[PDB]
Design a protein around this ligand. Structure first.
Ligand code: HEM
Ligand code: HEM
Ligand code: HEM
Ligand code: HEM
Lengths: 145, 141, 141, 145
């Protein structure tokens, strides 16, 4: 993705403050609640009936953490998104058969969660840069489809 | 806005928005123009700068129409008829742009009402905004 | 299926499909599995090879449900209620896949009814298939 | 895009039979009728009220021909889609501000038109290859967004 130097610096500064466990668990949980067809891929996590069961599920928190860690890698490798996500693209296409539209959905949920956590500090300009990042990750994950 | 439980969540959440509906509408427009520059195309006659008076006024109109909608959840097509014609027949707004505005409004609510923006409420709101979008694009169907 | 003019076009076009609804349903499924391999995931218990008996039988079920729908254009949610529960609550079908099946059905109609598949009719059918898709995914809303 | 040698050959053979004027005019016309928000970009073409006015409009036919010619270039340059469409991507993003979702829509309409023109010769296997092509062109046009 193409950010100005000022934009990149603001993106990186916010990431310093991101708790990958709290944010990641909340982001995956909301995806599963707001877009319930996504629960199909996570049957092995057990009880995903209602919002309470999803948000408190230890497997949802642990996997959400892994997803955010991987996002974090993208944020620190903005020049080589395709290379950073090549292996994960293969897994998601070849093995899991996830439609790419869902990568966009998770990206937008992550932005909503960042907005919830950072409030007024998550300015319209900062969201605009994060939208770039999110789209770049989605495109990199879709590359082997 | 659909199931009984969703109508209840939407009415309750919008009560917390209260008199800030106009302000949030304006902010959501700002987040949309910056995050998704393709949308600025529909507003050539506006000053689109931060704090612009026209964006403020238009955000108020958007907030009022959403407030209307929440009061008429059982008949959205009836309540929003004038707006369907405007957006679909006169303006020819690309349906994708409604999904973008919805995301920006949800983002804006998260900023201002973090304790009230629970997973259950987020899900109901999403459905509500999708129902409004369908109505505004229904002339395409 | 929506405006009076669209209902008329849809009823008329489906009259030309007639007793071939099952055959076209099967062919549309075949075009979908080949063109969009992600969809094969919902059918692990099927033989998905060309000419497969299970795809033939299932295509007939799809064709019959569409034929039902055309007879109940004024109450699709009522007529298709059992199917909403199945696709959205039991099977959890990703909504994107309905757009893919719709495209493949339109493709199949173009092949078999080239003179009857006019721009006006194509537009009405698109709206009809979108209306059916909305109903089948309505539990998500 | 990645087609087998057999797939590429079948794609090319069909293209030999494509009348870019007839197919192109019909494809653009149907896009304008079936997805009426697209008419916004073509205001300068004049009367686009009803299906009859669209399908018989000389500017719609002339532009449809140009679009198909450009598709034809992609079909003969399947290894370098990004390079082939770089200039057109810039025009569509920077100057026209067309949402990329519409490139997918036009691609699918073109497939429906090919199906109408070739009937039983447009087999499920041949459509599958064309779906690849269509997605590859859409992705190449979206690259500078
Ligand atoms: C922002 C986009 C996404 C990122 C960065 C991401 C990241 C990851 C990572 C890091 C893993 C672990 C792989 C490993 O163990 O080596 C994984 C696995 C997985 N992902 Fe994603 N993912 C994304 C989107 C999605 C979406 C939208 C779905 C919904 C279908 C999904 C479904 C899965 C599943 C089912 C697994 C396997 C978990 C298991 O072990 O059972 N992913 N993903
Ligand atoms: C939740 C969805 C939306 C709602 C509730 C809404 C509401 C409204 C209302 C109430 C008006 C009338 C203002 C007046 O009468 O002066 C209006 C006008 C307008 N809307 Fe929307 N709108 C929505 C989505 C969109 C989107 C997505 C776009 C395009 C990106 C858009 C573009 C416009 C434009 C260009 C006008 C005319 C503005 C002017 O010339 O003053 N709207 N909208
Ligand atoms: C126009 C849209 C659709 C219609 C009218 C339709 C119709 C039907 C009908 C009538 C059945 C019941 C068959 C029975 O009772 O044995 C069924 C089952 C099923 N459908 Fe759909 N369907 C549609 C879309 C889809 C899509 C897009 C998918 C996924 C790609 C899908 C996947 C399934 C599956 C997996 C079953 C169960 C099959 C079995 O186990 O025998 N359907 N559908
Ligand atoms: C398969 C995807 C597409 C291809 C291959 C394509 C190709 C082209 C070509 C070859 C031109 C002529 C550029 C020149 O003169 O140098 C053009 C221009 C144009 N395109 Fe596209 N296009 C595509 C999609 C779209 C879509 C979906 C829209 C709808 C918004 C669109 C809107 C336009 C407009 C408004 C022009 C300018 C025509 C004029 O001179 O007024 N294009 N495109």
């Amino acid at each position: 993705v193409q950010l100005s130097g000022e934009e990149k610096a603001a993106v990186l500064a916010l990431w310093d403050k991101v708790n990958e466990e709290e944010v990641g668990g909340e982001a995956l949980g909301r995806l599963l609640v707001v877009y319930p067809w996504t629960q199909r891929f996570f049957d092995s996590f057990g009880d995903l009936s209602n919002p309470g069961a999803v948000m408190g599920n230890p497997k949802v928190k642990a996997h959400g953490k892994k997803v955010l860690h991987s996002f974090g890698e993208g944020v620190h490798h903005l020049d080589n998104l395709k290379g950073t996500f090549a292996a994960l693209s293969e897994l998601h296409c070849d093995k899991l058969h996830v439609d790419p539209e869902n990568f966009r959905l998770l990206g937008n949920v992550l932005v909503v969660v960042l907005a919830r956590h950072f409030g007024k500090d998550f300015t319209p300009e900062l969201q605009a840069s994060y939208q770039k990042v999110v789209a770049g990750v989605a495109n990199a994950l879709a590359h082997k489809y | 806005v659909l199931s009984a439980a969703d109508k209840t969540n939407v009415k309750a959440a919008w009560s917390k928005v209260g008199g800030h509906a106009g302000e949030y509408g304006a902010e959501a427009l700002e987040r949309m123009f910056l995050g998704f520059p393709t949308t600025k195309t529909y507003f050539p006659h506006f000053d689109l700068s931060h704090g612009s008076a026209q964006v403020k006024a238009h955000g108020k109109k958007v907030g009022d129409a959403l407030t209307l909608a929440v009061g008429h959840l059982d008949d959205l097509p009836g309540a929003l008829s004038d707006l369907s014609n405007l957006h679909a027949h006169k303006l020819r707004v690309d349906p994708v742009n409604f999904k973008l505005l919805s995301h920006c409004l949800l983002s804006t609510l998260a900023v201002h009402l973090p304790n009230d923006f629970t997973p259950a409420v987020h899900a109901s709101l999403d459905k509500f905004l999708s129902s409004v979008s369908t109505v505004l694009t229904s002339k395409y169907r």
